[PDB]
Design an enzyme around this catalytic site. Structure first.
Site, PDB file in Angstrom:
ATOM      1  N   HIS A  41       3.055  53.771  23.615  1.00 20.38           N
ATOM      2  CA  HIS A  41       3.553  53.110  22.414  1.00 20.38           C
ATOM      3  C   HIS A  41       2.711  53.412  21.176  1.00 20.38           C
ATOM      4  O   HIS A  41       3.103  53.011  20.078  1.00 20.38           O
ATOM      5  CB  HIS A  41       3.799  51.605  22.625  1.00 20.38           C
ATOM      6  CG  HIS A  41       2.564  50.791  22.872  1.00 20.38           C
ATOM      7  ND1 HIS A  41       1.564  50.642  21.935  1.00 20.38           N
ATOM      8  CD2 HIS A  41       2.195  50.038  23.937  1.00 20.38           C
ATOM      9  CE1 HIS A  41       0.622  49.853  22.420  1.00 20.38           C
ATOM     10  NE2 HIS A  41       0.984  49.465  23.630  1.00 20.38           N
ATOM     11  N   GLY A 143      -5.907  45.423  18.535  1.00 19.19           N
ATOM     12  CA  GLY A 143      -6.629  46.667  18.696  1.00 19.19           C
ATOM     13  C   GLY A 143      -7.127  46.929  20.102  1.00 19.19           C
ATOM     14  O   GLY A 143      -7.746  47.973  20.335  1.00 19.19           O
ATOM     15  N   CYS A 145      -5.357  47.463  22.871  1.00 16.36           N
ATOM     16  CA  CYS A 145      -4.506  48.241  23.759  1.00 16.36           C
ATOM     17  C   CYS A 145      -5.200  49.522  24.172  1.00 16.36           C
ATOM     18  O   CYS A 145      -5.915  50.146  23.384  1.00 16.36           O
ATOM     19  CB  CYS A 145      -3.191  48.577  23.079  1.00 16.36           C
ATOM     20  SG  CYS A 145      -2.209  47.118  22.743  1.00 16.36           S
TER      21      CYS A 145
END
Ligand SMILES: [Cl-]
Ligand SMILES: [Cl-]
Ligand code: NA
Ligand code: NA
Lengths: 306, 306
Positions: A41, A143, A145
């Site tokens: 993503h 932040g 991920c």
């Protein structure tokens, strides 16, 4: 003596964490040999997340659209591909700090250490269990991920989790390092939510053994139970049924304490039916289910790692 | 979202752990620049420990009586000295993995991460607090002496604890990195016991703010209290007195949540006097006192950029 939530030493993983940027999105990647793994993503805009056609979005990207930073050094991307929900970026440099590693998909009930990272920089480490409902109760901010979860085995670092998303109740969902989500979750903006959860019985028993090792014995008794009768009580209290495999995995702790597994089950049955009556176990007034049998062994025997 | 017992990533400390052997005793040392720091009791036999004359024992040893092993490599000791209860071995190689570091002495109530080590190798990392009675409720086995406690701030490791001994109740005692013990403990085999402990009031309040941030609100009430009136209740429950400095430190969490500090004190007063009545806070049935206000901000908000 003592018993704490204990993570694996994180240094071998810290040396693999990098920052990945695509367009306006920055998150964390895992750099092993000359490949960086991160959530796919990263290629999506807010609009894309409604119904992202990931194959089409990736076809439109080129290597130069991806920026990878390892510390203060840019690694040039020289290839990209997608495996399930993970992006793989081939980079111009093999990680000289790559540990011996494997990718393993863990089972619900099993724990791992999470290295929470931001902008490619490790910030904290903590223990999580993969819940029966395929979420983890993590601690993650914007932040995070691409942060990874791992265990250390007798052979190497075993990466089992990559962080992708926060669910409405604040628990977390992610994939293995082959990019397959745990549970039914998807990397799209949908109505998805965690289902009902269950308590990890084998881990509660492991923690009761840890308590006995540490001198907490008040809950031991002379009552007996069969496995079937124990499981019926467990189910009433939203505990998972205990399998013979779980009984066998508890063997080493049973041997260390001299308390047969079914006798510990008789203790747990009383705790479920009657509570603690104001007493505590390992300083807690609730039963803890996020230590596996091996977590107890590694902490109570002082196992060390490469 | 989420709230976990979170340790600092241990890699910067792993790169400094070595094994120190003197005679038949092996423990852990910390290798920074060209000095290895370890507990001075490494020079004692069991018989020495009854009444050790450390000055005499050390003056009669030479550099070659100390073996320092970093991984598979032997380091050569070229000098040695004692600073309070810490032995300092000068070696002829500077550790190339030495991080930016400081030696700091912490106050009771403050927290740190521990990298538990055996034979110079890391076993696990956990978070703990220095208790008001100057012990730590650690997780340590035989062989763990010389393991260190630390905090990390913008890549700088502030070492605050070196492990020396386990006390009869199973709690732990050690020194700062200049060799000064925390609390009334000595590095000799003698009847010494931890004093009575108390609960870290400012930390409980910080954790209650963490709970509000995570969505718990049932313990909030319409009651008020003064600082002096609250401290009368705190003393009754074996809680540390709350000072105006503590109130000032809680300022940011109070402003962020809109709950005045004295209003949270009123909530805590009600919790102490009435219990939880079957409810939980952050998934606990007891009040947690090992998160500082800064720990809560660091985890729920993040570290500010330098
Ligand atoms: Cl949810
Ligand atoms: Cl050397
Ligand atoms: Na509890
Ligand atoms: Na004691």
């Amino acid at each position: 003596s003592g018993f704490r939530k204990m993570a694996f030493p994180s240094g071998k993983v810290e040396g693999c964490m990098v920052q990945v940027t695509c367009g306006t999105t920055t998150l964390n990647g895992l750099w092993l040999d000359d490949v960086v793994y991160c959530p796919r993503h990263v290629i999506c805009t807010s609009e894309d997340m409604l119904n992202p056609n990931y194959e089409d979005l990736l076809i439109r990207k080129s290597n130069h659209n991806f920026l990878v930073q390892a510390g203060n050094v840019q690694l040039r991307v020289i290839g990209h591909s997608m495996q399930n929900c993970v992006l793989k970026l081939k980079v111009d440099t093999a990680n000289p700090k790559t540990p011996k590693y494997k990718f393993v998909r863990i089972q619900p009930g099993q724990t791992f250490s999470v290295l929470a990272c931001y902008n490619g920089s490790p910030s904290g480490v903590y223990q999580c269990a993969m819940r029966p409902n395929f979420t983890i109760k993590g601690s993650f901010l914007n932040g995070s991920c691409g942060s990874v979860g791992f265990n250390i085995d007798y052979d190497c670092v075993s990466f089992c989790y990559m962080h992708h998303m926060e669910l409405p109740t604040g628990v977390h969902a992610g994939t293995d390092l082959e990019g397959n989500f745990y549970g039914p979750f998807v990397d799209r903006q949908t109505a998805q939510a965690a289902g009902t959860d269950t308590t990890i019985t084998v881990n509660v028993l492991a923690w009761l053994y840890a308590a006995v090792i540490n001198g907490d014995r008040w809950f031991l008794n002379r009552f007996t139970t069969t496995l079937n009768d124990f499981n019926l009580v467990a189910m009433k209290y939203n505990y998972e049924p205990l399998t013979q495999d779980h009984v066998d995995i508890l063997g080493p702790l049973s041997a260390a304490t001299g308390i047969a597994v079914l006798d510990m089950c008789a203790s747990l049955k009383e705790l479920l039916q009657n509570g603690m009556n104001g007493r505590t176990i390992l300083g807690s007034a609730l039963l803890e289910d996020e230590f596996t049998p091996f977590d107890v062994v590694r902490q109570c025997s002082g196992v060390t790692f490469q």
